[PDB]
């Protein structure tokens, strides 16, 4: 238990997930008379530690807020951001501080930039999977390499039928077209194959007997888990056509990713993990398009100027022991700064709808509406514009590229031109 210091310290705390760090740790600090805040990315986790310690801490999530007068608060990073960040606490624990979702990143950076001014003595950056870590072996999971033999084609290797006859098995595949293709062949060999991915109702998975569930990362109880060892990963490309493209890329998975997928077996009883590849990237590198996400979340959810968002991301990049990324702070701040007078109605629909880049989407929707032009495609991304579809004609004033573009485009909008400058100035 890192002692509370005389001057402000940032501390790192690497210890297994579940053991001590969101639970025993804060309680020991409180037992010494300190005020302590414990930050977590997930709502369920924050309530999970709340309930478990209530046998009483303050609990601060978007959906539920309990104030109890306790010296211990469990918040998510998002609610922490919503509450204006640093008010009130001697000690702030950033739990699961490896997390590369926007919110967590803005959260920690916020804690890093502000904790000292606001009078804290200690910030503990806690996680069980700090940068460079690999997958540790699990007592309940036997791990067996797949070999070229077997009669089912699987990412260069093969799977034997014997391993997926009898019981429950989960096969992780990388995309959607690949889940369909694989489920289908198993149905054509008797086996009970069920594909799952974003845009399916969770009902379609049987609950009791034999199945081979072919899903992405979109109770389960599996006897076996089968992993293609790859992940579709969001990335940015500065393609100058006219500006940037948000697209995907399939990289070999990292440690936490291998963990997450292996952990779908061994749920108490024994488990089996069979792999396409023996290796893994180490964790601790994230794409530029995560920076774009921070500026997006900041502008859409957290009422931050681009500039404030930068101040918080700077603190995060000025701390050692954290996921590292390209320094595109001035670029990304530049971009969002030009993005003014969004339609609040469009913004509100792309937020509700769980869109990625809800701000950039609603902004391209805004620009489209005011021009009376259509969006770059009639995909699901552009749902907010359906009400107006009947009124919209001509070429799409294209700002950036978030997906497929079916409509002809104009490249001359002031916002398009402005962004273009940003990339020639800051890149």
Ligand X SMILES: CC(C)c1ccc(Cn2cc(CC(=O)O)c3ccc(-c4cc(N)cc(N)c4)cc32)cc1
Query: Looking at beta carbons only, is 163 or 232 nearer to ligand X?
Result: 232
Q: How far is the CB of 34 from ligand X (least distance, A)?
A: 24
Can residue 265 be called a binding residue for ligand X (CB under 6 A)? no
- Smallest CA-to-CA distance from 364 within 378, 349, 376, 351 is with 376
Instruction: For residue 249, give both structure tokens.
Output: 């890329």
Query: Looking at beta carbons only, is 82 or 141 nearer to ligand X?
Result: 82
Cβ partners under 8 Å of residue 219, min gap 6: none
CA distances from 374 to 343, 389, 391 (A): 16, 7, 9
Query: Looking at beta carbons only, is 69 or 354 nearer to ligand X?
Result: 354
- Residue 363 and residue 369 in contact, taking contact as beta carbons nearer than 8 Å: no
For ligand X, the binding residue among 33, 190, 209, 354 (CB under 6 A) is 354
For ligand X, the binding residue among 61, 110, 265, 310 (CB under 6 A) is 61
What one-character DSSP code corresponds to residue 264? T
Query: Looking at beta carbons only, is 42 or 337 nearer to ligand X?
Result: 42
- Residue 313 and residue 336 in contact, taking contact as beta carbons nearer than 8 Å: no
**Pairing state of beta strands 157-159 and 152-154?**
antiparallel
Cβ partners under 8 Å of residue 368, min gap 6: 374, 375, 385, 392, 396, 397
Query: Looking at beta carbons only, is 39 or 183 nearer to ligand X?
Result: 39
Nearest residue to the partner ligand X, using Cβ: 78
Site string for ligand X, 184-223 (x = CB under 6 A): ----------------------------------------
Query: Looking at beta carbons only, is 102 or 170 nearer to ligand X?
Result: 102
Can residue 99 be called a binding residue for ligand X (CB under 6 A)? no
Q: How far apart are CA 414 and CA 32, in angstroms?
A: 59
For ligand X, the binding residue among 11, 27, 66, 82 (CB under 6 A) is 82
Q: How far apart are CA 30 and CA 414, in angstroms?
A: 55
Can residue 76 be called a binding residue for ligand X (CB under 6 A)? yes
Query: Looking at beta carbons only, is 82 or 420 nearer to ligand X?
Result: 82
Extended strands (E) in 228-342:
230-237, 245-252, 271-275
Residue 386, sorted as left (phi over 0), alpha (psi -120 to 50) or beta, turns out to be alpha
Q: How far apart are CA 106 and CA 306, in angstroms?
A: 12
Report 278-337 residues binding ligand X (CB under 6 A). Answer: 297, 301-303
Q: How far is the CB of 354 from ligand X (least distance, A)?
A: 5
Q: How far is the CB of 2 from ligand X (least distance, A)?
A: 27
Report 20-59 residues binding ligand X (CB under 6 A). Answer: 43
- In this chain, which stretch among 2-10, 77-85, 231-239, 257-265 interacts with ligand X, using CB under 6 A? 77-85
Q: How far is the CB of 41 from ligand X (least distance, A)?
A: 8
Query: Looking at beta carbons only, is 186 or 362 nearer to ligand X?
Result: 362
Q: How far is the CB of 95 from ligand X (least distance, A)?
A: 14
- Smallest CA-to-CA distance from 281 within 131, 126, 102 is with 131
Can residue 84 be called a binding residue for ligand X (CB under 6 A)? no
298 phi, psi to nearest 5 deg: -50, -50
Q: How far apart are CA 25 and CA 107, in angstroms?
A: 20
Interacting residues toward ligand X by CB under 6 A: 43, 61-63, 76, 78-79, 82, 103, 297, 301-303, 354
């Amino acid at each position: 238990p890192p002692a509370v210091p005389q001057s402000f310290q940032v501390a790192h705390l690497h210890a297994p997930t579940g053991s001590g760090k969101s639970t025993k740790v804060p309680a020991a600090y409180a037992a010494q008379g300190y005020k302590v805040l414990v930050l977590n990315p997930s709502v369920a986790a924050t309530l999970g530690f709340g309930a478990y310690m209530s046998k009483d801490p303050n609990i601060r999530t978007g959906v539920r807020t309990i104030t109890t007068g306790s010296p211990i608060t469990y918040s998510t990073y998002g609610k922490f951001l919503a509450d204006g960040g640093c008010s009130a606490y001697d000690i702030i624990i950033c739990d699961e501080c490896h997390s590369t979702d926007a919110t967590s990143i803005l959260g920690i950076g916020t804690v890093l930039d502000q904790a000292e001014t606001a009078g804290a003595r200690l910030v503990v950056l806690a996680t069980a999977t700090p940068p460079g870590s690999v997958t540790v072996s699990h007592p309940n999971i036997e791990e067996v390499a797949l070999s070229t033999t077997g009669e089912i084609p699987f990412y260069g290797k093969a799977i034997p039928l014997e391993v997926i006859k009898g019981g429950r098995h989960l096969i992780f595949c990388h995309s959607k077209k690949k889940c369909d293709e694989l489920a289908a062949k198993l149905v054509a060999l008797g086996i009970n194959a069920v594909a799952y991915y974003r845009g399916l109702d969770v009902s379609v998975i049987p609950t009791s007997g034999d199945v081979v569930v072919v899903s992405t990362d979109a109770t389960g109880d599996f006897d076996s888990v089968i992993d293609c060892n790859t992940c579709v990963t969001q990335t940015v490309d500065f393609s100058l056509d006219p500006t940037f493209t948000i697209e995907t890329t399939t990289l070999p998975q990292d440690a936490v990713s291998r963990t997450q997928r292996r952990g779908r077996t061994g749920r108490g009883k024994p488990g089996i993990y069979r792999f396409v590849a023996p290796g893994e990237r180490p964790s601790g590198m994230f794409d530029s398009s995560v920076l774009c996400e921070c500026y997006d979340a900041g502008c859409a959810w957290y009422e931050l100027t681009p500039a404030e968002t930068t101040v918080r991301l700077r603190a995060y990049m000025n701390t050692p022991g954290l996921p590292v990324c390209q320094d595109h702070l001035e670029f990304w701040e530049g971009v969002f700064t030009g993005l003014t007078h969004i339609d609040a109605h469009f913004l509100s629909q792309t937020k509700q709808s769980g869109e990625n880049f809800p701000y950039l989407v609603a902004y391209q929707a805004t620009v489209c509406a005011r021009a009376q032009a259509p969006p770059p495609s009639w995909d699901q991304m552009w749902k907010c514009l359906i009400r107006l579809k009947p009124t919209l004609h001509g070429p799409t004033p294209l700002l950036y590229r978030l997906g497929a573009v079916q409509n002809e485009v104009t490249l001359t909008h002031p916002i398009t031109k402005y962004i273009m400058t940003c990339m020639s100035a800051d890149l």
